[PDB]
From Swiss-Prot:
The gene is HSP90AA1. This is Heat shock protein HSP 90-alpha. ATP binds at N36, D78, K97, F123. ISGylated. Homodimer. Identified in NR3C1/GCR steroid receptor-chaperone complexes formed at least by NR3C1, HSP90AA1 and a variety of proteins containing TPR repeats such as FKBP4, FKBP5, PPID, PPP5C or STIP1. Forms a complex containing HSP90AA1, TSC1 and TSC2; TSC1 is required to recruit TCS2 to the complex. The closed form interacts (via the middle domain and TPR repeat-binding motif) with co-chaperone TSC1 (via C-terminus). Interacts with TOM34. Interacts with TERT; the interaction, together with PTGES3, is required for correct assembly and stabilization of the TERT holoenzyme complex. (Microbial infection) Interacts with herpes simplex virus 1 protein US11; this interaction inhibits TBK1-induced interferon production. Residues 1-209 are annotated as: Interaction with NR3C1. It is found in: Nucleus; Cytoplasm; Melanosome; Cell membrane. The TPR repeat-binding motif mediates interaction with TPR repeat-containing proteins like the co-chaperone STUB1. Belongs to the heat shock protein 90 family. It comes from Homo sapiens. Molecular chaperone that promotes the maturation, structural maintenance and proper regulation of specific target proteins involved for instance in cell cycle control and signal transduction. Undergoes a functional cycle that is linked to its ATPase activity which is essential for its chaperone activity. This cycle probably induces conformational changes in the client proteins, thereby causing their activation. Interacts dynamically with various co-chaperones that modulate its substrate recognition, ATPase cycle and chaperone function.
Amino acid sequence: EVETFAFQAEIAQLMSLIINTFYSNKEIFLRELISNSSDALDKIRYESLTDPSKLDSGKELHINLIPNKQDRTLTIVDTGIGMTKADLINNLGTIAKSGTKAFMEALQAGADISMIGQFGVGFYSAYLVAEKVTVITKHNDDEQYAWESSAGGSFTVRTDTGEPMGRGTKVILHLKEDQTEYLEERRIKEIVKKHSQFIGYPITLFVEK
Ligand SMILES: C#CCCCn1c(Cc2cc(OC)c(OC)c(OC)c2Cl)nc2c(N)nc(F)nc21
């Protein structure tokens, strides 16, 4: 069964602001998601130092960026720690509520949307460029899940029966019609170099086709 959930009103409000604010500097979505990847790869590596079996679902620690012009998707893939169903439905939203409030106050005081990552809610910058976001994820302790949302106040979760990933997270950005620049190899390399050049994991940019 596909389960449908309501976001918290605060998360829904942050999502509308991201969607609705005039703000040209949309490219920062990408460092935010790569930085999320990097932090998740730090967590699995750190956990595997006192428990080596945590890497039996895959030893390689890396980030892939995969454009697809036909589907109009940019996918950010990591082999980090992954997320459990409790993360997807409850834990992450509980934390997000307070980083939301702070981010919202900061914008009023004169901060801008690019600073979102400082408030633990940078994931939502995905909606600068994406009309829908699908998150596929598998943690050692749980099953493989698909989370999805096009904003509008709700998200769904379901067991994922697609191709098993081992361990880690794929964020599939279904791009808005006017943001297909983020599918172009030269544009992605530009942004990675500008904002993500010191990530301590190999980042592979796949090419089409
Ligand atoms: C916030 C925060 C950090 C943790 C959640 N998270 C994120 C950000 C994120 C935050 C969310 O709530 C604030 C969130 O819920 C809608 C979310 O949804 C699937 C993601 Cl991917 N990306 C990763 C990732 N690549 N890998 C792992 F393992 N965890 C991740």
